[PDB]
Amino acid sequence: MDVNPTLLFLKVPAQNAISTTFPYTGDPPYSHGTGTGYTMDTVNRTHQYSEKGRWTTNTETGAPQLNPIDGPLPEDNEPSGYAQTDCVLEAMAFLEESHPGIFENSCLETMEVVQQTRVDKLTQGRQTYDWTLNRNQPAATALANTIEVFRSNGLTANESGRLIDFLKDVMESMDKEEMEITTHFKKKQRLNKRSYLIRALTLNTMTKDAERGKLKRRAIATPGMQIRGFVYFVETLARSICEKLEQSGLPVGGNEKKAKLANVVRKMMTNSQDTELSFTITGDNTKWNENQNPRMFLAMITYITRNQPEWFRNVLSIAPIMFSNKMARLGKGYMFESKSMKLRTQIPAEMLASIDLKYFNDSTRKKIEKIRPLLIDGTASLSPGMMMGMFNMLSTVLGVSILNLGQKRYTKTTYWWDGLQSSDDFALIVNAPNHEGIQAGVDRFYRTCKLLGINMSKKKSYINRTGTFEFTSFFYRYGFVANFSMELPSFGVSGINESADMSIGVTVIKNNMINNDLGPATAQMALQLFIKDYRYTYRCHRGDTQIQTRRSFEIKKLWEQTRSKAGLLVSDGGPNLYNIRNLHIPEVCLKWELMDEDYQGRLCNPLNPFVSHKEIESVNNAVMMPAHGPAKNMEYDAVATTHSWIPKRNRSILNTSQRGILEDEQMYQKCCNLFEKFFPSSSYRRPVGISSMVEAMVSRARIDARIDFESGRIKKEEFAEIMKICSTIEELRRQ
Amino acid sequence: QVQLQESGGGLVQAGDSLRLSCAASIMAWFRQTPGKERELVARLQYYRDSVKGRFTLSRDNAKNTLYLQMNSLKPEDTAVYYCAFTDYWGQGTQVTV
Amino acid sequence: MEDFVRQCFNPMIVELAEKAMKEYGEDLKIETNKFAAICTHLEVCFMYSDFHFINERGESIIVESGDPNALLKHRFEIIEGRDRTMAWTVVNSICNTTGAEKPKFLPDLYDYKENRFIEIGVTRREVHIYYLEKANKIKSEKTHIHIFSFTGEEMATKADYTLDEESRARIKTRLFTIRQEMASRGLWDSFRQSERGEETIEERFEITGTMRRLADQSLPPNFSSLENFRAYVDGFEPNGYIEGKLSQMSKEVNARIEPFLKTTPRPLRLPDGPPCSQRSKFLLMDALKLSIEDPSHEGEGIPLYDAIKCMRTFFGWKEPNVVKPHEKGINPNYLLAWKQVLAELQDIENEEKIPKTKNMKKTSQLKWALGENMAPEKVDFDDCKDVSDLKQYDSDEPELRSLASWIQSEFNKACELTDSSWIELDEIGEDVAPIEHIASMRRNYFTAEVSHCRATEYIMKGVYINTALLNASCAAMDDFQLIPMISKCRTKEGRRKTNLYGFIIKGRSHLRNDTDVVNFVSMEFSLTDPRLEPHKWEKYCVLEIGDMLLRSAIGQVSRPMFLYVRTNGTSKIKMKWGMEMRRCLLQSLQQIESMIEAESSVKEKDMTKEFFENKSETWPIGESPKGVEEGSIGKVCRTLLAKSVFNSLYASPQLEGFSAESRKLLLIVQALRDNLEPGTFDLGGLYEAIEECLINDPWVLLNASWFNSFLTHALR
Amino acid sequence: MERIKELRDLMSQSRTREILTKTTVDHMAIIKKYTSGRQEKNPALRMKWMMAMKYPITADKRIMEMIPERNEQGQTLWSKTNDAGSDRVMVSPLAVTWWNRNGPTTSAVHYPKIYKTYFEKVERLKHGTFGPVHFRNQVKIRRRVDINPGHADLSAKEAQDVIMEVVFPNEVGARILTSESQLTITKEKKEELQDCKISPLMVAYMLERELVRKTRFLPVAGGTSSVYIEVLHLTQGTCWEQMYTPGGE
RNA sequence: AGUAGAAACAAGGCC
RNA sequence: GGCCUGCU
């Protein structure tokens, strides 16, 4: 007899055992080298899906741009980006009519937010493409570098501390004859108008790793800092709009998505009488981002912001204006090998414009030949369409408009449709009195989608009777069925620290028990395995064992020293008291009454040199990138113990010409620590104002010395010493 | 505009005394010689070291008039003597010892 | 008017007033009388505060110039002259230290004698109105208020005047100096009334310059300016434009539904080529175990001593010789490496105490076997351009290979029971709730079912091997290291036992990226002759190292005993994911527990015990030439565990792609079997998407064969 | 005394003087987050990889003067080589366990008073009473429920001023809290935590967690109470219901 | 050789 | 041969 697990589906329905079809117990695919090939392929594919448009050359950037809007209507089922302006404007108008007051309200709240938003909001972001160094750097670092360059060039309106003023300075920089940047190898280099325009309109391309569910790798993009404020405002407007649309599912979580899917299916099927047939289409959109033209987003926003202050319209329109002229950096480059001479070489992507094509294979040779005409200063113009879901929310708005355009008031026919859209994925429930009606409805829905630059993937889509469908790895079969294979990768040690890892593991087990219908015995097994892996990872074994490690000696002496050994934490080699009933309690508090007072005091000592807290945002928040989803943050319950240390940093900056960044880091951190000691609320509430550091610090020294004498340790001798030391630092700052 | 009129001055013996007054229609006396500079006498009481004990500045506020008493005058005190206030100056009177 | 503040006031005050001007964001060129008025307010604040000191008594000491000493305390300490944030900082600090009441508006000074605030304001109008005005602005105030006015008059409540009168004569002399100096200037046409409390501003975000031209090039094809396009949008109204283009659009743009029937789906085509080879990092079906029967636990003990003791338990060693060559390497190197390992093992046996971890010599043998100094040296392009052989890295579709029957048998025997328990679980909090007791009983049942399973043994082998390899790579980055493959089990009798499959030599492991490869050489004992399925051992070199005698009724077999030696490699990501193989247990048993719970939701009672003991219900878990064979729930547990283990062992992008694109077709087939009239828009496209994932991986090809068999058995 | 002294020492050196002079208060946050350290994409892989090194964690410089450089057998506990972009020094994990067996001891009696939420959870569970498990299909319907069982009927911003006035009374600024509920909360949490020396930031964070109301969408069947939602994993399942009554009731 | 698979590893750089 | 780094 030959064993075959798949035959199990002959008795258990597919959805009731779908977890077996998710090989999420092995290493996910990773990219190894350059992503330049993928970037070039994506650029060429985006440009050839809109080949029948019209070509122009921008007078500012001098780059060739392709406009397919209002182009010839498609005559085949292949992907097409020839969106029609009038059709999309009409779709938005019908969306407004079905939801009166949506645009005006959303614009009002967006106007409030834009005129009260601060610059620091831009620091709350992941890697961004700093143009000062032409590389990806943390959002805060890139923002600081750009602000420094602007201030050195004379653009100091951002000193007002307002994001709108920062954007005003950004736009004013566009009209400058010559800017100056700094490079280390420090050298001051001058950038002319066109070079700075291209550096501000460019995107950095990388390869996406840890992407499960496809054989081929893809490319993703990261924009600069000049354009992120406009993107933030536009996405704020789009989120405020989608929050008023029940057909959208992008700005919500997973459980809300399931609830809305259940509600829509029940509404569609229940209202349908015996005569009307119902069919569900589990649709995926092929080349979703490559076929969405930024000009159409400009049209949608300018229709949304009608009868609004002109400044609001301008600030919200700046973003799509820059995306329509966006450029993409090709990537890291290409690495060649010569086996005859036994050597390797790495050529940067910027040489692709001039480098001969003898080194490249046929596929890459043709890709380079096709993309060369669009190469301007080492970057390729990508006007026709978006690169990687930067306008997720606006795309969801367009999809929701398409979904609502079939409310049976615009169809003008017996058939009708509804459903749920989340960018690149949708479920469409279509009802009609007969199979011919369903066919006509789906055909018209597809045709209308093709008029908006949205394509339906026929290969990854199928239609059945309502009651069974899929949506973003959520399988609905007369009710959503748990999978538990999507969350399997999150059952190990997170990698934050000991206490954080313990709390995160127990909380993940608890949550997957609540949401993903994890069984009790399975949860107990998960707890046991997690504890085993945790002890084997942090070298913290039970203590009563003879497992020799680098940490087994101190742990054993602590074990033999303690009297009530049941109170020792698993991190210190103690027994595990966790169970299904204790999954919502931190380890420290669960073992508090069992700890010896000496060990308890040594553990939770504020003066410990290991605990370090930076800001209110990073107290008990851990960023865990979930499998098959975007990066997410979790609140984990933990007590600040000596085990809450933060791990070592990379330390490879020491071998790079960018070595002075570490000295600047140290000096900035010293100044920030001094300010915090002067202003204790610096971390919890970020200080605001327009004065400089030393003014506030010296003046508060004055006052605090005064009052702490009026009652406290200070003495006249010390108070006068502080006053004249303040005068000394004053005259020092003078010179 | 507010303006000052010096009174007093003239020729005087060595070791002898003079009374200067300044009428105004912080306050001062100053002097100046050839061969040097504008030289500080007194403020109102604050004086320069070379002049201490010998000259007594004083004021009336009622009839708007300051007084310099100069006792034990010396050849090196031969100068034009001016009054001033806090911005404005007088025309000065000459004291010849 | 600004010429006055150029002339008279000192720098300190003028820049203080200029920063106060910047504070609330209004411009100085439009209205300057406010600047002069508030700078005079600030000046009176200073001149009233300074020159006033206190000593340990009350009765402030007043000195025209602060002498050098510790006695420089200031009688009145200023509030204004600071930013709003700091003004409120001082307010709150004074309230919290003085125990006084917090005012709602900005004071100007604080004093000790009377322990309270002073809000000085000198207005153009006479005092006896401005005083009570600001008083009714401030609610129930104990802070004393004192104001002057240009005429020279003073006033205050309580008839209180807090310090010397010569200072106030100073104040009013300053005041009339101001007055009859504007007399020379001539400003009272507006000086009395120049500020009326204007607060208004319009936000301006103007598109101009280059950024405007960009806006003119981001419009539809037949538009010339953003102004015109916005006007058109504002004037646009729906007039049935989607219908016109829908009618005009070609009818070939359709989404016709192709019915999906029993005869529609065709079997997935498998690639053809040379048979598929073995990819695992260790032997799974052909492993052999040398044991000692020690009482130590899994992690307890020292590796090298245990390995040597286990190997001394076997007698019959012969001089090794080549049996099956690598067919691409230098087998004599493998032979010499094996003899070197034996020699150095003896060398450890001789000395005093067995080292916890041993380093081996870097001979040419393992230099070749571990791929040392073979990475091409990195150079610059400007120095290597004329080399004809210089080209890209080989980037093409992997070699095509057809499925072989060995993977099927390997999976078959990976789901079979064993004579040992390969899982020793940790401790949990004592169960207190009845649901916890039910969970514990279920867990005990599953552990009894799966512990005696080759899948669990493979899990432990992989976890231990990858953990040791990662730790050695991170610790001994430079020097080759010896690691014996150790796994500890427990017999049926209950006696604990150790097992030594072989050895792993880890090489240079300077791993920077998650994809960087660490090469090692693995040696494992076995009894399976490699002359029967040579195509499964394409990358192995197999020697003959001894003879084994296992008790059998046919005299005694005296079988040969071979050594499978190969060069393999891994990476940080692969090591990390292989050291988390225990979650296969989770996956499998979560699936089984979901089955049990779903069935128990029907009958209102827990159904675990009868499922595991009666074994009445069975699921299709394989096909025999006679037909489909069904097994009890325990066999399903073992089968799913083996499937998860093989997923973790043979993981690859092909597996992910095939899994997704075959789950799609499985859902379609399930819809067909449920009588839900399934339909497809392009089924050929889906088939081509599935078939492109099957290239050379044995596991994915076996999964595809299983899928074809399931289709054949289904659709009936 | 000290604080202004390192201020003067910083201003002594030209670079830090320039940083202090030209940098405005508003930019405080930016430069504080200014770092070359990228946020890790795969934390688990490197935590499993770094812990195999010697000196894998980081600690303040003060550790060099509280913990000896080596333990009894000579295993090093800390190193004097500083981190990449900080003055902290890299140390071994043993320095943690050492601190828990011979490090300085204090009085942790006030931690229960600080971490009110967690200890209240423990007390509620310790006195809970379980019941029989009933096996029947549960119709889990998704609903919006409040998870925090100690929220004082305050929002994030609404309680943020309360938290500042409780911890940072001087940086409150204009705000003086009007609602009398906030008055009593301030009084209680002021007199209760008057000398607690854990950290201002952690105290503020835990006060925010305790007082601020927070809500999330979850699949529930029955219950719906704040105390009954924290144990939602233990009382409700796919095909079983476990009757439970927390200690509070 | 080996790992791996649309491009890489099989140490890097600095003296 | 000596020393530096391992997400920069």
Author numbering:
A (entry chain B): 1 to 185, 207 to 756
B (entry chain F): 1 to 25, 33 to 51, 58 to 99, 113 to 123
C (entry chain A): 1 to 716
D (entry chain C): 1 to 249
Authors' own words:
Central to the replication cycle of influenza viruses is the viral RNA-dependent RNA polymerase which transcribes and replicates the viral RNA genome. The influenza virus RNA-dependent RNA polymerase is a heterotrimeric multifunctional machine composed of polymerase basic 1 (PB1), polymerase basic 2 (PB2) and polymerase acidic (PA) subunits, that catalyzes both primer-independent replication (vRNA to complementary RNA (cRNA) and cRNA to vRNA synthesis) and primer-dependent transcription (vRNA to mRNA synthesis) in the nucleus of infected cells. PB1 houses the polymerase active site, whereas PB2 and PA contain, respectively, cap-binding and endonuclease domains required for transcription initiation by cap-snatching. High-resolution structures of the complete viral polymerase from a number of human, avian and bat influenza A viruses, as well as influenza B, C, and D viruses have been determined. These structures have revealed that the polymerase is a highly flexible macromolecule that can assume a variety of distinct conformations, enabling the polymerase to perform both transcription and replication that require different initiation and termination mechanisms.
Using cryo-EM we determined the structure of 17 polymerase-nanobody complexes at resolutions between 4.5 and 6.7 Å; this is sufficient resolution to accurately position each nanobody bound to the polymerase heterotrimer. We have not determined the structures of Nb8211 and Nb8212 which, based on their similarity to Nb8200 and Nb8198, respectively, are expected to bind to the PA endonuclease.
